[PDB]
Chains A and B, each alone.
Chain A
Amino acid sequence: GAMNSSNYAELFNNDIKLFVDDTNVYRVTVHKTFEGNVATKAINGCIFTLNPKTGHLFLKIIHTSVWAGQKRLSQLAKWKTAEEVSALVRSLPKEEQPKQIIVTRKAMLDPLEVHMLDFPNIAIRPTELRLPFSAAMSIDKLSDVVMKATEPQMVLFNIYDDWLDRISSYTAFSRLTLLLRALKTNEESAKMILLSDPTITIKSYHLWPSFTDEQWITIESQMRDLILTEYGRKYNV
């Protein structure tokens, strides 16, 4: 059934599982036409498919050409997401295939279930967690590969960098969701926090800066402050 605060540690056990987030699959800019009507222009998107235990991110880039000539794109985007996840699973060796796939939005359940009928033993689950994966496109290296793509492409990342050398996957996921929640609440401020010290750099093979353990504690505190801040600025408290 649904994944929530009560069965949270299940994410870090040794049953392979993947989160799938479809928020950034179908992306548009809205604009005025010469006649003064409104129209949309699609831009490249991505499926965010994440193993929360290992940090492996399967970033399937969705090139705007897949929408050409198609109707009802918001609906199509859910089925295209399901199609690509099913294709990913089929491409993996049996012993790497997930036992569960957790979708971040309930509208993905039926599309994914139907595309995965061949895999009756893979559980398709919703979640009551409000996960901030829509903010993945605030990570500069991910936004860059998506916007530069000229054709469909899958790119593999570890969204935890080398953190698992020092911390557990529960703690790494907690850091990830704090970073993404901050970037979603105030991207400018969050990015300022992460880069304000030019002596701390991002390795070429990494997504986030090379913080020491002590620096991560400070960064994490600054992200909480930001989130609580914006929560006041928003509600006036």
Chain B
Amino acid sequence: MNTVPFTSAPIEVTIGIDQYSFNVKENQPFHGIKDIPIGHVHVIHFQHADNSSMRYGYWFDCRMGNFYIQYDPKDGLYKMMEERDGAKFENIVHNFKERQMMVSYPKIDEDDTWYNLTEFVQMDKIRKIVRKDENQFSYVDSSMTTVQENELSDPAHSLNYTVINFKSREAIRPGHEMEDFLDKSYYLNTVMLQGIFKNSSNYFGELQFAFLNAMFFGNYGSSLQWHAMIELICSSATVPKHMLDKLDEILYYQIKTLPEQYSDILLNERVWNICLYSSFQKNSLHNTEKIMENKYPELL
């Protein structure tokens, strides 16, 4: 179980850790989060009480270093940093725990939600998408645009997911125009899976990362990414049986976790109705269709 200490909390803020969250008051004696499960990526995120604009946060894996949070009064945000002095860090953490100034990652033992949302998400892959090689953790916020949004503006601060474009030469083989547009199996299996991602685990990892950035930061380009990656699978007539079964599990847990009150802005009516009721895979996502029909029957 690892720890992310905070130097202090000088400004009132709501702090998220994965799917959990808690309020910290201005100058409250808060010094971090303990008992963080090893083996998963994690996200620690922030919304200031005085400007709910710009949610922002950091993806990290405690196996990759000792990380802490410190407020920067010049740039006006809580920054993640790495402590290289391992003895300094252990000393700091132990004192804060002894004084009980830390919240405990509040995982119920029965609960596999975070595993289910991050099963295929790897820190190594997140760092290719979010380019800042000098840090081992990755900053994301509500306003960062994707490479695709930039094509349609700062490149250093962009989300480099693969751009999914169904009306593109990559997606459409010369001479198979109708075939490839109506059945996207070529684009999914040959271009994306064999060509770019290398395997379906990697594809699902980007899919899962995109959803989580959409949900935790309201990042619009990430929401577009998530839906495009779903639609590419549902619009392919030839998809390995194990991919379809895993996709149904992935989406089930995403739909289950989504805040009921954000369904209007995080779910695309067209994509979901197409995927569940018109697409080649309309009958292959039993768990997802059942939770969608019972939780969001309005959208459909």
A74-97 interface mask toward B, CB cutoff 8 Å, 1 = contact, 0 = none? 001001001100000000000000
A-B contact count (CB 8 A): 22
Q: Are B178 and A117 in contact (CB under 8 A)?
A: no
Q: Are A118 and B169 in contact (CB under 8 A)?
A: yes
* Alpha-carbon distance between A113 and B178 when the two chains are bound, in angstroms: 11
B177 contacts the other chain (CB 8 A): yes
A114-149 interface mask toward B, CB cutoff 8 Å, 1 = contact, 0 = none? 110110000000000000000000000000000000
* Alpha-carbon distance between A115 and B167 when the two chains are bound, in angstroms: 10
Name B169-205 residues within 8 Å CB distance of A. 169, 172, 177-178, 181
* Alpha-carbon distance between A115 and B179 when the two chains are bound, in angstroms: 12
Residue of B nearest to A113 (CB): B167
A111 contacts the other chain (CB 8 A): yes
Interface range, B side: under 10
Residue of B nearest to A117 (CB): B169
Q: Are B177 and A82 in contact (CB under 8 A)?
A: yes
CB distance from B160 to the nearest CB of A (A): 23
* Alpha-carbon distance between A117 and B181 when the two chains are bound, in angstroms: 12
* Alpha-carbon distance between A82 and B182 when the two chains are bound, in angstroms: 15
The residues of A that contact B181 with a CB separation of less than 8 Å are 110-111, 114
Residue of B nearest to A111 (CB): B178
The residues of B that contact A111 with a CB separation of less than 8 Å are 177-178, 181
B91 contacts the other chain (CB 8 A): no
Residue of A nearest to B180 (CB): A114
Task: Pick from A76, A115, A117, A118 the residue with the most CB of B within 10 Å.
Answer: A117
Name A48-76 residues within 8 Å CB distance of B. 76
The residues of A that contact B168 with a CB separation of less than 8 Å are 117
The residues of A that contact B167 with a CB separation of less than 8 Å are 110, 113-114, 117
* Alpha-carbon distance between A79 and B167 when the two chains are bound, in angstroms: 14
Q: Are A79 and B177 in contact (CB under 8 A)?
A: yes
* Alpha-carbon distance between A83 and B181 when the two chains are bound, in angstroms: 13
The residues of B that contact A114 with a CB separation of less than 8 Å are 167, 172, 177-178, 181
* Alpha-carbon distance between A76 and B181 when the two chains are bound, in angstroms: 12
Residue of B nearest to A83 (CB): B177
The residues of B that contact A118 with a CB separation of less than 8 Å are 169
The residues of B that contact A115 with a CB separation of less than 8 Å are 177
Residue of B nearest to A120 (CB): B169
* Alpha-carbon distance between A111 and B178 when the two chains are bound, in angstroms: 7
A154-192 interface mask toward B, CB cutoff 8 Å, 1 = contact, 0 = none? 000000000000000000000000000000000000000
Question: Could you show 5 A-B contacts with beta carbons less than 8 Å apart?
Answer: A79-B177, A79-B178, A111-B178, A114-B172, A118-B169
Beyond contacts A111-B177, A114-B178, A117-B169: 13 other A-B pairs, Cβ-Cβ < 8 A, are: A79-B177, A110-B167, A111-B178, A111-B181, A114-B167, A114-B172, A114-B177, A114-B181, A115-B177, A117-B167, A117-B168, A117-B172, A118-B169
Query: Which residues on A are within 8 Å of B, measured CB to CB?
Result: 76, 79, 82-83, 110-111, 113-115, 117-118
Those 9 A-B pairs whose CB atoms lie nearest each other, nearest first: A79-B178, A114-B177, A117-B169, A114-B181, A115-B177, A113-B167, A114-B172, A114-B167, A117-B172
